[PDB]
Amino acid sequence: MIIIGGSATNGIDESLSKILSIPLVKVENKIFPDGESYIRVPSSIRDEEVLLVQTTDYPQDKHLIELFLIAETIRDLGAKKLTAIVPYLAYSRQDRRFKDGEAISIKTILHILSEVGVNTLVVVEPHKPEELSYFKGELKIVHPYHQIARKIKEIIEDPFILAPDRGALDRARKIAEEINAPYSYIEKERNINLKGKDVVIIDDIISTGGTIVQATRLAYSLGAKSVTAAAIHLLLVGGAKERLREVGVKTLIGTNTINVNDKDIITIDVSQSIALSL
Amino acid sequence: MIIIGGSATNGIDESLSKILSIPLVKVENKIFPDGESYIRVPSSIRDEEVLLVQTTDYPQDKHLIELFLIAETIRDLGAKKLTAIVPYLAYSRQDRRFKDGEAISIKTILHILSEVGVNTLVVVEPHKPEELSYFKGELKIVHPYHQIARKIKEIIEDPFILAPDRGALDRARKIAEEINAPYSYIEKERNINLKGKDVVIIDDIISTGGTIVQATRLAYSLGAKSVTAAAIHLLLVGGAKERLREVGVKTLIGTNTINVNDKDIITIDVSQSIALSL
Numbered sequence: 263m264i265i266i267g268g269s270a271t272n273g274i275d276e277s278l279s280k281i282l283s284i285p286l287v288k289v290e291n292k293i294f295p296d297g298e299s300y301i302r303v304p305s306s307i308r309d310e311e312v313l314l315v316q317t318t319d320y321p322q323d324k325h326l327i328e329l330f331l332i333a334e335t336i337r338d339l340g341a342k343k344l345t346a347i348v349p350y351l352a353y354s355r356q357d358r359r360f361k362d363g364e365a366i367s368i369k370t371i372l373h374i375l376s377e378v379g380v381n382t383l384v385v386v387e388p389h390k391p392e393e394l395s396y397f398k399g400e401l402k403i404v405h406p407y408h409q410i411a412r413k414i415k416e417i418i419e420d421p422f423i424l425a426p427d428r429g430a431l432d433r434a435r436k437i438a439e440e441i442n443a444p445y446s447y448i449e450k451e452r453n454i455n456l457k458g459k460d461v462v463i464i465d466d467i468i469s470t471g472g473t474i475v476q477a478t479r480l481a482y483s484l485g486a487k488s489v490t491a492a493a494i495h496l497l498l499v500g501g502a503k504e505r506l507r508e509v510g511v512k513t514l515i516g517t518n519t520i521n522v523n524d525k526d527i528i529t530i531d532v533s534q535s536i537a538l539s540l
Numbered sequence: 541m542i543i544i545g546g547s548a549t550n551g552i553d554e555s556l557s558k559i560l561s562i563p564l565v566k567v568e569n570k571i572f573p574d575g576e577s578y579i580r581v582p583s584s585i586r587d588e589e590v591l592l593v594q595t596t597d598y599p600q601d602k603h604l605i606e607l608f609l610i611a612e613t614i615r616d617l618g619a620k621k622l623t624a625i626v627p628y629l630a631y632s633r634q635d636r637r638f639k640d641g642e643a644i645s646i647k648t649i650l651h652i653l654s655e656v657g658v659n660t661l662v663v664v665e666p667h668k669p670e671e672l673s674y675f676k677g678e679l680k681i682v683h684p685y686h687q688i689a690r691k692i693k694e695i696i697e698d699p700f701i702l703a704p705d706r707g708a709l710d711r712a713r714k715i716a717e718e719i720n721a722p723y724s725y726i727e728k729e730r731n732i733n734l735k736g737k738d739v740v741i742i743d744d745i746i747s748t749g750g751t752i753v754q755a756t757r758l759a760y761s762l763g764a765k766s767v768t769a770a771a772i773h774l775l776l777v778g779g780a781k782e783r784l785r786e787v788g789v790k791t792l793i794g795t796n797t798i799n800v801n802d803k804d805i806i807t808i809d810v811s812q813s814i815a816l817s818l
């Protein structure tokens with residue numbers, strides 16, 4: 263077994279190397295003046311079992327195409343098994359045809375990964391885990407809930423765990439139950455004793471921050487002592503970070519499935535969670 | 541039969557509609573705040589034969605992923621046959637493994653297009669036509685030589701046609717012979733009566749413009765009255781346009797397999813050449 267780090271690992275390839283004590287081989291990668299990607303897999307692999315680490319955060323399209331290229335190269339170079347660890351899988355929000363003739367993006371991406379030679383696919387908090395049925399090989403989903411629980415407990419004195427919609431309830435519950443905290447969810451259509459408590463709003467993804475902002479209102483208008491926001495994938499887009507500080511979200515918790523900053527942001531390294539699931 | 545225009549047609553979908561008198565359906569496409577692509581195929585297609593127009597010029601990776609998404613959607617929507625007209629095919633320069641463990645990018649791209657549902661692939665001046673053997677369906681290569689010949693004859697009084705390397709010779713010969721002009725090629729290693737003639741340097745692609753600049757020297761140092769440069773794919777990168785004016789390339793001739801400008805650049809619409817080859 264060896265670990266091959268793609269063009270987009272967020273330290274995950276290196277820390278997985280320590281944790282598992284497996285040798286680490288880094289993919290050579292540059293950008294032509296064209297704009298196109300150069301990809302070279304710099305070792306022998308002849309009969310090795312490979313753990314490819316390639317996340318597909320921004321830029322999603324280039325990182326995806328780089329993933330495709332690296333993957334075929336690896337299968338071409340003799341590898342015995344390809345395991346693709348893609349922390350943030352792109353085009354996940356596109357689950358189905360919301361209107362007729364819309365593309366089911368995640369289907370295409372997944373089909374493409376079977377072709378191209380990926381045997382086992384490992385993903386952290388897929389937006390909706392049924393999605394991954396499209397992938398023909400073996401699936402290993404990673405829910406880094408314990409690591410998020412542990413962090414919340416360190417940072418938050420008297421936590422109430424609030425999920426922004428029914429979608430996020432299962433995740434809130436499993437996180438809150440491990441830390442024996444109270445939990446609830448906001449009910450779109452037309453517990454609650456979060457009065458005076460330190461609320462933590464947890465979602466899988468935070469892009470614009472719209473759902474989290476609407477949720478931060480209800481919280482304060484219900485006696486929230488403070489509001490903290492947490493997601494596995496922090497794809498903060500344009501306003502986001504500021505749009506949240508303005509509504510009074512003090513702290514931001516995310517993980518390294520994505521690339522980020524540090525005025526804040528509390529970044530959990532989810533390699534430990536990924537290692538278990540291997 | 542119908543024509544579906546992707547997110548990147550350069551008028552080619554529209555003019556192919558006139559030329560062939562086939563109805564034109566445009567793909568709905570936007571960019572999420574994410575960065576990700578939205579793709580919707582807005583008509584019925586149930587049993588239609590489709591002509592998809594998607595070029596893959598910059599940004600190559602997004603356009604490729606958009607191509608993949610649109611393609612599967614079309615096959616999913618019932619279409620009887622998918623013909624993908626991709627004027628400029630990206631990752632063409634990556635023909636083979638120039639070093640061990642390099643990716644054969646074009647192989648991956650092509651394999652991906654077979655999977656995904658493309659039956660027939662139509663390409664204009666592929667960098668090297670053996671490349672396309674990797675594609676499993678039917679191939680239609682388009683060499684728009686007659687349209688380039690016609691244009692040269694309109695604009696250039698007393699043309700000499702110069703190919704920058706032996707690679708570009710076949711193309712120079714076929715273009716020059718149709719216009720009964722003299723032709724030659726520059727010989728790397730360590731006719732020629734272009735003395736006093738209006739030289740036209742023809743290549744498949746112009747990126748940085750390096751090969752064209754070295755060739756413009758020999759020309760002037762051999763009595764060239766003037767130098768014009770022509771390529772099918774004008775991917776002018778950074779300096780390029782200026783780097784050429786400086787060495788005295790007066791005129792630039794390209795085609796609409798790519799998107800461009802017009803201080804210059806003489807742009808041939810190669811839809812007519814694509815139509816023949818259908």
Ligand SMILES: Nc1ncnc2c1ncn2[C@@H]1O[C@H](COP(=O)(O)O)[C@@H](O)[C@H]1O
Binds near residue numbers: 356469573
């Ligand atoms: N990358 C993206 N960014 C923003 N919205 C998206 C994205 N992908 C899909 N959507 C839309 O989000 C809606 C689903 O909501 P949700 O998946 O809960 O955010 C669908 O109507 C999609 O069209």
Ligand SMILES: Nc1ncnc2c1ncn2[C@@H]1O[C@H](COP(=O)(O)O)[C@@H](O)[C@H]1O
Binds near residue numbers: 295
């Ligand atoms: N998009 C690109 N831009 C610039 N050079 C490239 C590109 N793709 C491949 N190459 C390199 O160009 C060399 C082949 O030369 P040519 O194909 O004649 O330009 C190979 O060694 C490739 O590594």
